[PDB]
Amino acid sequence: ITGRPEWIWLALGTALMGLGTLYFLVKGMGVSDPDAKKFYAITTLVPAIAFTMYLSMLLGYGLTMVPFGGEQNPIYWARYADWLFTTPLLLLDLALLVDADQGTILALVGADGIMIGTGLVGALTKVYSYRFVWWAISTAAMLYILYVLFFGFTSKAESMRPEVASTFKVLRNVTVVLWSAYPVVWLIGSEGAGIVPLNIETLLFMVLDVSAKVGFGLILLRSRAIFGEAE
Amino acid sequence: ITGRPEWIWLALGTALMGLGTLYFLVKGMGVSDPDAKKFYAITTLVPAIAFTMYLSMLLGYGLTMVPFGGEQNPIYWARYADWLFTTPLLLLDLALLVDADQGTILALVGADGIMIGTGLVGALTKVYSYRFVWWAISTAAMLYILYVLFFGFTSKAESMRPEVASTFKVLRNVTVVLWSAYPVVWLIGSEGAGIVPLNIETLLFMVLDVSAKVGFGLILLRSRAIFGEAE
Amino acid sequence: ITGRPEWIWLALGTALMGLGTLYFLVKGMGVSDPDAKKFYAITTLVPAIAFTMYLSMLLGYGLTMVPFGGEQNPIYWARYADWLFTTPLLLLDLALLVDADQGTILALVGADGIMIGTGLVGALTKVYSYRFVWWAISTAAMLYILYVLFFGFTSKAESMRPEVASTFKVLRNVTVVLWSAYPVVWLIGSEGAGIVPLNIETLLFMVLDVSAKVGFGLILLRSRAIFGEAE
Numbered sequence: 224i225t226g227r228p229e230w231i232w233l234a235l236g237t238a239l240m241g242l243g244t245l246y247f248l249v250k251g252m253g254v255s256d257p258d259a260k261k262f263y264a265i266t267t268l269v270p271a272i273a274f275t276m277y278l279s280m281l282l283g284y285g286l287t288m289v290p291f292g293g294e295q296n297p298i299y300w301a302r303y304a305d306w307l308f309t310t311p312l313l314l315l316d317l318a319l320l321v322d323a324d325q326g327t328i329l330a331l332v333g334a335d336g337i338m339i340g341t342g343l344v345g346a347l348t349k350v351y352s353y354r355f356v357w358w359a360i361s362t363a364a365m366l367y368i369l370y371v372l373f374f375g376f377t378s379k380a381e382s383m384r385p386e387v388a389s390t391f392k393v394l395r396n397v398t399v400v401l402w403s404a405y406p407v408v409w410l411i412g413s414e415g416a417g418i419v420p421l422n423i424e425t426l427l428f429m430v431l432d433v434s435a436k437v438g439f440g441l442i443l444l445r446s447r448a449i450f451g452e453a454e
Numbered sequence: 455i456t457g458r459p460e461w462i463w464l465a466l467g468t469a470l471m472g473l474g475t476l477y478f479l480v481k482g483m484g485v486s487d488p489d490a491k492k493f494y495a496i497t498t499l500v501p502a503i504a505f506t507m508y509l510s511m512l513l514g515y516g517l518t519m520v521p522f523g524g525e526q527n528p529i530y531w532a533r534y535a536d537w538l539f540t541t542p543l544l545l546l547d548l549a550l551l552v553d554a555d556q557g558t559i560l561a562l563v564g565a566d567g568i569m570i571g572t573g574l575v576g577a578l579t580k581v582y583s584y585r586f587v588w589w590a591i592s593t594a595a596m597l598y599i600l601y602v603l604f605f606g607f608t609s610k611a612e613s614m615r616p617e618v619a620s621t622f623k624v625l626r627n628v629t630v631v632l633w634s635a636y637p638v639v640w641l642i643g644s645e646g647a648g649i650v651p652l653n654i655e656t657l658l659f660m661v662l663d664v665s666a667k668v669g670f671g672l673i674l675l676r677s678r679a680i681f682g683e684a685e
Numbered sequence: 686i687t688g689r690p691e692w693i694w695l696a697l698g699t700a701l702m703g704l705g706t707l708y709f710l711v712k713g714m715g716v717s718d719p720d721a722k723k724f725y726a727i728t729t730l731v732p733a734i735a736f737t738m739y740l741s742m743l744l745g746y747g748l749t750m751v752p753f754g755g756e757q758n759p760i761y762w763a764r765y766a767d768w769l770f771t772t773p774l775l776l777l778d779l780a781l782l783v784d785a786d787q788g789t790i791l792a793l794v795g796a797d798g799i800m801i802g803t804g805l806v807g808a809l810t811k812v813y814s815y816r817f818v819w820w821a822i823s824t825a826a827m828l829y830i831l832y833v834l835f836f837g838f839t840s841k842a843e844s845m846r847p848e849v850a851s852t853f854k855v856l857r858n859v860t861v862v863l864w865s866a867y868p869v870v871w872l873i874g875s876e877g878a879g880i881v882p883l884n885i886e887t888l889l890f891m892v893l894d895v896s897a898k899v900g901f902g903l904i905l906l907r908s909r910a911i912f913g914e915a916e
């Protein structure tokens with residue numbers, strides 16, 4: 224484990240995702256509202272999945288070597304197995320908050336799968352220049368997601384209860400800022416141009432992951448928007 | 455790229471799926487009917503997924519070598535990753551058109567997963583004679599799907615609006631004819647008996663894919679069956 | 686095939702899953718109740734999936750070698766591909782029986798995915814002591830599932846029709862007893878401590894699989910709880 228300088232950030236990430244999972248699990252014990260139960264189930268699964276994948280990276284299972292640039296490059300593939308399941312769950316939290324229609328939910332989840340799937344292909348591609356073709360396709364899929372979150376959901380939240388509109392607006396802004404950083408870290412990190420070393424890259428993804436999952440969840444599950452209007 | 459004679463058909467397929475995706479995306483911009491939005495989302499995702507997998511084959515990522523018959527045989531595995539997601543989406547288009555019940559939808563999607571999954575196992579199997587055992591199981595799963603589309607959905611469409619009944623009947627006939635060709639191309643192509651060479655096999659799958667996805671989508675999204683009855 | 690002593694139990698399992706699939710398929714022909722169709726579709730898919738994965742193990746495709754303990758250990762990875770899809774389908778049978786809320790269904794299916802996913806990682810892990818870390822995480826996920834089936838569903842079934850309450854109680858008890866045996870067989874078998882040899886381990890999993898899928902299905906599909914109350 225300790226033979227890799229980035230191990231400290233993988234261990235911290237593992238701990239923070241595990242602690243986040245347990246807090247949400249305990250906090251959700253005393254909840255019977257069927258609407259609130261939906262948000263607790265979605266939001267608790269997110270850091271639980273991330274916990275297992277951070278642990279796999281810490282123990283060395285989620286790491287492979289990819290030859291490109293005449294070098295064997297360490298690629299943590301477990302990140303994409305994490306994101307494949309956690310990013311659509313996070314979008315479902317937002318879509319259920321605004322009572323989005325089914326067709327829009329399917330478009331979001333499908334574009335998200337394309338985003339993560341093409342990012343994985345780009346991470347494992349051995350022809351250096353082709354890695355950035357996949358990065359560009361994946362980034363186009365992300366821009367579609369961000370467009371929908373702004374010019375489809377925002378207008379839908381305003382016609383909703385005030386507390387669900389204000390909570391959505393906050394979580395929307397958090398998501399757009401944090402998610403946009405991921406393609407940048409990829410491009411300048413060891414998967415892309417190799418400007419930033421792997422140990423610093425790992426620290427950046429850990430800060431982003433914890434903020435986008437645990438921080439996101441703390442804002443959502445403390446809001447009254449997750450409960451139905453009741454007397 | 456150009457070192458493979460089949461590259462021209464992979465490049466054409468990539469272009470036609472990309473163009474198809476963009477047309478459906480633009481055409482769906484001016485749509486607010488929640489029913490129509492469902493069909494546009496399903497139908498636009500189909501060629502978008504196929505685009506990415508054709509590109510992976512063009513660039514050489516979606517290709518592996520499988521030893522059988524005393525030879526290293528080029529097997530494009532990316533086809534099955536495509537079909538795993540696009541064939542159930544196409545069946546969902548048909549099932550939603552006739553307002554199929556949930557139990558029937560689950561049976562269709564499950565049989566479809568078995569069809570594609572066993573076809574993938576057959577494509578990667580190293581014992582030559584066993585490849586055709588998997589082909590037979592996969593073909594049995596397809597025949598179940600075709601039976602349901604005829605002796606379960608057809609009777610349901612007649613009790614529906616006339617425009618949804620006539621549109622379903624057309625898309626049903628297109629699907630049964632085109633899908634039935636796939637097991638035949640597999641059997642006589644490089645995955646099976648090896649009668650037809652890979653470059654011709656690739657041309658045939660490209661014609662079938664574009665027809666079953668883009669051609670299918672053009673018929674559906676030009677129909678009024680996708681809109682609810684409104685004044 | 687016959688070069689492996691466990692082949693006899695893989696062949697028996699294949700036959701019993703295939704026969705089970707055909708019986709459920711025939712029995713479900715004469716069913717039009719939309720509620721009953723749901724249970725028949727879920728319950729017939731379970732042994733059909735298991736059939737294909739037992740066949741892959743029989744023919745040698747679903748087997749790999751994992752080095753640990755200074756030895757190349759035969760690991761049947763196809764079991765986890767089976768369980769990944771069949772265990773959530775079995776939980777869906779139970780959840781639909783008691784009309785569970787959506788949030789609870791998602792929590793069950795998500796915990797089940799974590800259970801199977803971490804068990805697969807543990808089966809393929811090359812550092813011997815780490816294999817049991819994954820076993821423990823997977824077992825914690827199972828205990829969560831069992832808790833929900835007892836202290837969330839049981840109370841919900843009592844407020845239901847008497848026949849659905851008594852049928853659920855029976856299937857609940859069958860599930861908790863049979864599922865609990867799996868982590869024990871893993872721990873003492875070739876994936877874990879290696880006390881029980883592989884051929885005996887394979888026999889035990891076959892008895893458990895057939896009972897948990899075909900036996901489970903025979904109890905459910907003979908009950909009147911799967912039909913709506915009708916005159």
Ligand SMILES: CC(C)CCC[C@@H](C)CCC[C@@H](C)CCC[C@@H](C)CCOC[C@@H](CO)OCC[C@H](C)CCC[C@H](C)CCC[C@H](C)CCCC(C)C
Binds near residue numbers: 332344347534538539
């Ligand atoms: C509606 C939305 C959900 C739609 C989703 C969008 C999606 C279509 C976007 C594209 C996804 C696609 C790129 C997934 C590729 C997975 C692949 C990286 C797995 C590893 O295989 C890659 C190479 C080794 O580098 O295999 C070496 C050769 C091996 C012999 C490969 C044989 C196994 C194949 C991988 C079998 C295909 C399985 C499916 C891809 C499983 C789904 C994986 C997940 C990442 C989507």
Ligand SMILES: CC(C)CCC[C@@H](C)CCC[C@@H](C)CCC[C@@H](C)CCOC[C@@H](CO)OCC[C@H](C)CCC[C@H](C)CCC[C@H](C)CCCC(C)C
Binds near residue numbers: 730749765770805
């Ligand atoms: C309700 C419906 C959706 C049900 C679906 C029906 C489905 C059950 C039908 C059978 C599907 C099954 C054959 C999928 C097999 C995937 C497999 C080809 C992936 C590549 O692995 C094959 C060998 C190399 O040749 O791995 C070499 C050895 C490696 C060490 C393998 C270890 C990884 C395992 C593959 C882990 C299992 C992952 C799941 C199979 C992922 C789903 C893939 C998709 C193709 C279903």
Ligand SMILES: CC(C)CCC[C@@H](C)CCC[C@@H](C)CCC[C@@H](C)CCOC[C@@H](CO)OCC[C@H](C)CCC[C@H](C)CCC[C@H](C)CCCC(C)C
Binds near residue numbers: 802
């Ligand atoms: C809501 C719920 C459904 C959530 C589900 C819970 C889930 C997150 C729990 C953890 C699942 C995770 C451990 C799955 C790992 C699959 C992995 C074993 C496949 C084989 O790859 C392992 C190594 C060889 O040993 O690959 C060698 C290196 C290769 C180069 C690997 C590159 C391919 C990657 C495997 C791509 C990721 C694909 C996804 C993991 C596909 C889903 C598989 C299924 C088992 C979940």
Ligand SMILES: *C/C=C(C)/C=C/C=C(C)/C=C/C1=C(C)CCCC1(C)C
Binds near residue numbers: 313402405432435
């Ligand atoms: C909890 C994890 C989250 C919210 C991860 C989000 C990840 C992304 C938005 C990743 C995006 C990428 C691109 C847009 C292209 C480059 C490759 C990716 C996958 C890093």
Ligand SMILES: *C/C=C(C)/C=C/C=C(C)/C=C/C1=C(C)CCCC1(C)C
Binds near residue numbers: 540592633
């Ligand atoms: C857009 C792609 C489509 C509609 C693909 C359809 C593919 C099939 C219907 C494939 C069927 C197969 C068999 C029936 C057995 C032989 C292997 C397959 C997977 C080619």
Ligand SMILES: *C/C=C(C)/C=C/C=C(C)/C=C/C1=C(C)CCCC1(C)C
Binds near residue numbers: 775800805827871897
């Ligand atoms: C039809 C198959 C069924 C119902 C299989 C159930 C399997 C389990 C409940 C497996 C549980 C495991 C653990 C709890 C940890 C050890 C590894 C597993 C996956 C065997």
Ligand SMILES: CCCCCCCCCCCCCCC
Binds near residue numbers: 418
């Ligand atoms: C979206 C965030 C990207 C900003 C990356 C900042 C990295 C600064 C760290 C110093 C770079 C290390 C280079 C010298 C080793």
Ligand SMILES: CCCCCCCCCCCCCCC
Binds near residue numbers: 239243246433437
């Ligand atoms: C009462 C609110 C705080 C509860 C404690 C939460 C502990 C989980 C770890 C959170 C750290 C990361 C927060 C986002 C920066």
Ligand SMILES: CCCCCCCCCCCCCCC
Binds near residue numbers: 635638650651654
């Ligand atoms: C379902 C369509 C299958 C028909 C295949 C027709 C192939 C004819 C092309 C000529 C065969 C090439 C053999 C000589 C190289």
Ligand SMILES: CCCCCCCCCCCCCCC
Binds near residue numbers: 473477669
């Ligand atoms: C107005 C209808 C035609 C629009 C142009 C569609 C261009 C997408 C490519 C379609 C070619 C394949 C059609 C099926 C044979």
Ligand SMILES: CCCCCCCCCCCCCCC
Binds near residue numbers: 885
């Ligand atoms: C949950 C069931 C686990 C019980 C396992 C009993 C196995 C007894 C078979 C004899 C053990 C073989 C050891 C000598 C070869």
Ligand SMILES: CCCCCCCCCCCCCCC
Binds near residue numbers: 705896
């Ligand atoms: C009339 C009920 C029996 C029908 C025959 C079922 C045959 C399928 C194989 C069942 C054997 C396994 C039963 C569970 C132990």
Ligand SMILES: CCCCCCCCCCCCCC
Binds near residue numbers: 325328
């Ligand atoms: C490729 C993996 C995608 C599945 C991720 C799991 C979450 C799915 C959310 C589905 C939302 C409901 C759509 C109607």
Ligand SMILES: CCCCCCCCCCCCCC
Binds near residue numbers: 769777787790794798
């Ligand atoms: C990782 C694979 C999980 C999917 C298994 C297929 C069954 C899914 C059941 C979904 C139940 C409905 C949830 C609302």
Ligand SMILES: CCCCCCCCCCCCC
Binds near residue numbers: 366369370373407
């Ligand atoms: C185009 C939709 C408007 C909202 C999206 C904001 C774009 C942020 C740019 C992200 C940069 C990634 C490289």
Ligand SMILES: CCCCCCCCCCCCC
Binds near residue numbers: 593600601634637638
């Ligand atoms: C048996 C259901 C009737 C409709 C299915 C038509 C069968 C077409 C044969 C396909 C040939 C594939 C080898």
